[PDB]
Design a protein around this motif. Structure first.
Motif, PDB file in Angstrom:
ATOM      1  N   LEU A   1       4.335  16.897  -1.729  1.00  0.00           N
ATOM      2  CA  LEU A   1       3.391  15.972  -2.372  1.00  0.00           C
ATOM      3  C   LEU A   1       3.552  14.534  -1.890  1.00  0.00           C
ATOM      4  N   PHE A   2       4.802  14.138  -1.673  1.00  0.00           N
ATOM      5  CA  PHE A   2       5.048  12.837  -1.048  1.00  0.00           C
ATOM      6  C   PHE A   2       4.579  12.800   0.393  1.00  0.00           C
ATOM      7  N   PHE A   3       4.848  13.884   1.133  1.00  0.00           N
ATOM      8  CA  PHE A   3       4.586  13.968   2.575  1.00  0.00           C
ATOM      9  C   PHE A   3       3.095  13.894   2.830  1.00  0.00           C
ATOM     10  N   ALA A   4       2.330  14.656   2.042  1.00  0.00           N
ATOM     11  CA  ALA A   4       0.861  14.636   2.158  1.00  0.00           C
ATOM     12  C   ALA A   4       0.121  13.545   1.397  1.00  0.00           C
ATOM     13  N   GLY A   5       0.694  13.052   0.304  1.00  0.00           N
ATOM     14  CA  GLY A   5      -0.007  12.203  -0.646  1.00  0.00           C
ATOM     15  C   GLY A   5       0.141  10.707  -0.462  1.00  0.00           C
ATOM     16  N   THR A   6       0.996  10.283   0.464  1.00  0.00           N
ATOM     17  CA  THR A   6       1.261   8.842   0.537  1.00  0.00           C
ATOM     18  C   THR A   6       0.719   8.200   1.785  1.00  0.00           C
ATOM     19  N   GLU A   7       1.218   8.613   2.949  1.00  0.00           N
ATOM     20  CA  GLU A   7       0.892   7.935   4.206  1.00  0.00           C
ATOM     21  C   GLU A   7      -0.619   7.873   4.483  1.00  0.00           C
ATOM     22  N   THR A   8      -1.310   9.011   4.363  1.00  0.00           N
ATOM     23  CA  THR A   8      -2.746   9.000   4.674  1.00  0.00           C
ATOM     24  C   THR A   8      -3.520   8.089   3.731  1.00  0.00           C
ATOM     25  N   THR A   9      -3.205   8.130   2.440  1.00  0.00           N
ATOM     26  CA  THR A   9      -3.921   7.336   1.472  1.00  0.00           C
ATOM     27  C   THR A   9      -3.623   5.857   1.730  1.00  0.00           C
ATOM     28  N   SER A  10      -2.360   5.594   1.979  1.00  0.00           N
ATOM     29  CA  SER A  10      -1.949   4.198   2.244  1.00  0.00           C
ATOM     30  C   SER A  10      -2.608   3.620   3.503  1.00  0.00           C
ATOM     31  N   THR A  11      -2.590   4.383   4.580  1.00  0.00           N
ATOM     32  CA  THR A  11      -3.157   3.925   5.839  1.00  0.00           C
ATOM     33  C   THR A  11      -4.674   3.799   5.728  1.00  0.00           C
ATOM     34  N   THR A  12      -5.301   4.666   4.920  1.00  0.00           N
ATOM     35  CA  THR A  12      -6.740   4.490   4.667  1.00  0.00           C
ATOM     36  C   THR A  12      -7.028   3.146   4.015  1.00  0.00           C
ATOM     37  N   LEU A  13      -6.221   2.760   3.028  1.00  0.00           N
ATOM     38  CA  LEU A  13      -6.435   1.484   2.362  1.00  0.00           C
ATOM     39  C   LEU A  13      -6.207   0.343   3.372  1.00  0.00           C
TER      40      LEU A  13
ATOM     41  N   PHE B   1       0.836  -1.221   0.000  1.00  0.00           N
ATOM     42  CA  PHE B   1       0.000   0.000   0.000  1.00  0.00           C
ATOM     43  C   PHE B   1       0.860   1.257   0.000  1.00  0.00           C
ATOM     44  N   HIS B   2       2.002   1.217   0.691  1.00  0.00           N
ATOM     45  CA  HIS B   2       2.948   2.348   0.641  1.00  0.00           C
ATOM     46  C   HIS B   2       3.512   2.470  -0.761  1.00  0.00           C
ATOM     47  N   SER B   3       3.732   1.326  -1.429  1.00  0.00           N
ATOM     48  CA  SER B   3       4.322   1.289  -2.771  1.00  0.00           C
ATOM     49  C   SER B   3       3.379   1.876  -3.823  1.00  0.00           C
ATOM     50  N   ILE B   4       2.099   1.488  -3.799  1.00  0.00           N
ATOM     51  CA  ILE B   4       1.203   1.964  -4.870  1.00  0.00           C
ATOM     52  C   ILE B   4       0.913   3.472  -4.728  1.00  0.00           C
ATOM     53  N   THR B   5       0.752   3.965  -3.496  1.00  0.00           N
ATOM     54  CA  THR B   5       0.441   5.403  -3.277  1.00  0.00           C
ATOM     55  C   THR B   5       1.688   6.241  -3.600  1.00  0.00           C
ATOM     56  N   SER B   6       2.855   5.692  -3.269  1.00  0.00           N
ATOM     57  CA  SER B   6       4.113   6.365  -3.654  1.00  0.00           C
ATOM     58  C   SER B   6       4.279   6.404  -5.150  1.00  0.00           C
TER      59      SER B   6
ATOM     60  N   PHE C   1       8.938   6.287   4.892  1.00  0.00           N
ATOM     61  CA  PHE C   1       7.814   5.915   5.725  1.00  0.00           C
ATOM     62  C   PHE C   1       8.148   5.754   7.180  1.00  0.00           C
ATOM     63  N   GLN C   2       9.391   5.367   7.480  1.00  0.00           N
ATOM     64  CA  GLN C   2       9.816   5.399   8.876  1.00  0.00           C
ATOM     65  C   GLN C   2       9.569   6.757   9.528  1.00  0.00           C
ATOM     66  N   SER C   3       9.686   7.822   8.734  1.00  0.00           N
ATOM     67  CA  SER C   3       9.511   9.196   9.225  1.00  0.00           C
ATOM     68  C   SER C   3       8.122   9.445   9.797  1.00  0.00           C
ATOM     69  N   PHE C   4       7.088   8.885   9.168  1.00  0.00           N
ATOM     70  CA  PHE C   4       5.709   9.108   9.641  1.00  0.00           C
ATOM     71  C   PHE C   4       5.470   8.579  11.050  1.00  0.00           C
ATOM     72  N   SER C   5       5.973   7.373  11.318  1.00  0.00           N
ATOM     73  CA  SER C   5       5.853   6.760  12.631  1.00  0.00           C
ATOM     74  C   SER C   5       6.516   7.666  13.638  1.00  0.00           C
ATOM     75  N   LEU C   6       7.675   8.210  13.266  1.00  0.00           N
ATOM     76  CA  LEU C   6       8.443   9.045  14.149  1.00  0.00           C
ATOM     77  C   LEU C   6       7.731  10.382  14.399  1.00  0.00           C
TER      78      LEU C   6
END
Ligand code: HEM
Ligand SMILES: OC[C@@H]1O[C@@H](O[C@H]2[C@@H](O)[C@H](O)[C@H](OCCCCCC3CCCCC3)O[C@@H]2CO)[C@H](O)[C@@H](O)[C@@H]1O
Ligand SMILES: OC[C@@H]1O[C@@H](O[C@H]2[C@@H](O)[C@H](O)[C@H](OCCCCCC3CCCCC3)O[C@@H]2CO)[C@H](O)[C@@H](O)[C@@H]1O
Length: 463
Positions: free
Chosen positions: A268-280, A144-149, A176-181
């Protein structure tokens, strides 16, 4: 007023002693119970107006949309963004970058294909990859991190990466480690006392290093773009920005410079990946917990789309049940629960209070998404929240997971397209199972972003 009511602060420590140990969100919701929907809390020295409930959030972000259109800093990432790039800019810089970004993402991208076509193709690649697991247990986080990225890569770099490309994966891991942090307890403490804590080791130094590594890569891509540019045929976001830099070279007031390029692409990476991925990821957890819902979605896909043709965005309007399910996934998911910080752009008159210019404001999106005026069962997964008596999709004032107003999520349409096409293309091709019985599945999650529990899943090829 003068500022909205709240706990009396200490100097230096602000309202530390009135906060809750569970985190910022809990601290805010607790304070709400005592002080009401609009209150002031001191985070260190900084007074911060907190907006809870649908009304207070809409009165601010919609009714005084210009006044509440400012952006606040996030202490752990400000040393990187420094008020540059589309998310963290203010004033004219923000207006110019947002106008440009909206227009460009709409029109330029990989292979001249539309964003929708690029998502369909990513979904096709994903189905091919899942097929290869042959029903093995997997943790879907990575894919999911891969497809949104890859969607953001298609937009900004004009290319996508193979799922097993090792350099892609190394940089994906550290990004993605950054988001957890960022969503950790330590970074919430850093929000409060950065002025002191910046001099010591901590998550902020790891976040800095990870994002700088990504910035280095973005820098290298910009050079490669410039070296291979065809001004008659821009490939992607980067090519279009380079052409604008050229068009504005004689204007030293222009925001279209190198620093805004690197940091807008990062944004765009910062806003566009993690939330979409975690939603899926959250959505599939719910789909494991509630197989009757998943079965109904598959029935709707079969009726509207069938079992050959790939889903297309056109299908969504004819699929109100699936659309309601996605709404409810976002609602219960509540992935950005206390919003992203705003500021007021001038001294602002609000409910009898005066909020000085540049005062930070948190719209507590969670409080709208769980508002019992709007959602009969706020803590229970209920797609019926978004369905009327005729089974048609219905809209709701409480539904604001992308926020509202002038700062509303710039990528809402893209995100919407991703959720619809990924959910439906996956379910068209696969049924799901996991080692944990539905009743034993626990949905319990968190900071700026929410994080569901890890789980295993099987994607079972249908046919
Ligand atoms: C399910 C997925 C997503 C959700 C729930 C979401 C939600 C949000 C929220 C709550 C904000 C804060 C708005 C505010 O300041 O009040 C935001 C901002 C933003 N989002 Fe999203 N987002 C998602 C996906 C995306 C995607 C895919 C993109 C890019 C393609 C994106 C780009 C941005 C940008 C650039 C901003 C900053 C807007 C500004 O400051 O003007 N988002 N989003
Ligand atoms: O006056 C000192 C003590 O106060 C009471 O504890 C308070 C507080 O003093 C006590 O510190 C505690 O607050 C937890 C500390 C908050 C820090 C957590 C923050 C970290 C950053 C982001 C999230 C919030 O909760 C209680 C709220 O009533 C206790 O009842 C007594 O031990 C004692 O009276
Ligand atoms: O010899 C090295 C080059 O190999 C090929 O691919 C390159 C690059 O062109 C190519 O862009 C690739 O990038 C892989 C990393 C992609 C990271 C993007 C991430 C950003 C943050 C979120 C996750 C995604 O790195 C490869 C290895 O250096 C390229 O085709 C050529 O430029 C060249 O032959």
């Amino acid at each position: 007023g003068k500022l909205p009511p709240g706990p009396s602060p200490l100097p230096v420590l602000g309202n530390l002693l009135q906060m809750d140990r569970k985190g910022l969100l809990r601290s805010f919701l607790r304070l709400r119970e005592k002080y009401g929907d609009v209150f002031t809390v001191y985070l260190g020295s900084r007074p911060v107006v907190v907006l809870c409930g649908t009304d207070a959030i809409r009165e601010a972000l919609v009714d005084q949309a210009e006044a509440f259109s400012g952006r606040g800093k996030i202490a752990v990432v400000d040393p990187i963004f420094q008020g540059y790039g589309v998310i963290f800019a203010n004033g004219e810089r923000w207006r110019a970058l947002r106008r440009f970004s909206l227009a460009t993402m709409r029109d330029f991208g990989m292979g001249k294909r539309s964003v929708e076509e690029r998502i369909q193709e990513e979904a096709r690649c994903l189905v091919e990859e899942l097929r290869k697991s042959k029903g093995a247990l997997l943790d879907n986080t990575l894919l999911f991190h891969s497809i949104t990225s890859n969607i953001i890569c298609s937009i900004v770099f004009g290319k996508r990466f193979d799922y097993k490309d090792p350099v892609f994966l190394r940089l994906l891991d550290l990004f993605f480690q950054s988001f957890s942090l960022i969503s950790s307890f330590s970074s919430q403490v850093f929000e409060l006392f950065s002025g002191f804590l910046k001099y010591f080791p901590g998550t902020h130094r790891q976040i800095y290093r990870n994002l700088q590594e990504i910035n280095t890569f973005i820098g290298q891509s910009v050079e490669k773009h410039r070296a291979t540019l065809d001004p008659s045929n821009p490939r992607d976001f980067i090519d279009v920005y380079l052409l604008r830099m050229e068009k504005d070279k004689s204007d030293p007031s222009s925001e279209f410079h190198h620093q805004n390029l690197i940091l807008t692409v990062l944004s765009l990476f910062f806003a566009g990946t993690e939330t979409t991925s975690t939603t899926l990821r959250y959505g599939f957890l719910l789909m494991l917990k509630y197989p009757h819902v998943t079965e109904r979605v598959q029935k709707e896909i079969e009726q509207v789309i069938g079992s050959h043709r790939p889903p297309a965005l056109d299908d969504r309007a004819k699929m109100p049940y699936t659309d309601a399910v996605i709404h409810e996934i976002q609602r219960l998911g509540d992935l950005i629960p206390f919003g992203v910080p705003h500021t007021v752009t001038k001294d602002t008159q609000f409910r009898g209070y005066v909020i000085p210019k540049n005062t930070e404001v948190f719209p507590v999106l969670s409080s709208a998404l769980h508002d019992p005026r709007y959602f009969e069962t706020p803590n229970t997964f209920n797609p019926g929240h978004f369905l009327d008596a005729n089974g048609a999709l219905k809209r709701n004032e409480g539904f604001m997971p992308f926020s509202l107003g002038k700062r509303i999520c710039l990528g809402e349409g893209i995100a919407r397209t991703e959720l619809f096409l990924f959910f439906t293309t996956i379910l068209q091709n696969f049924s799901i199972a996991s080692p944990v019985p539905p009743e034993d599945i626990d949905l319990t999650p968190s900071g700026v972003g929410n994080v569901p529990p890890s789980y295993q899943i099987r994607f079972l090829a249908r046919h």
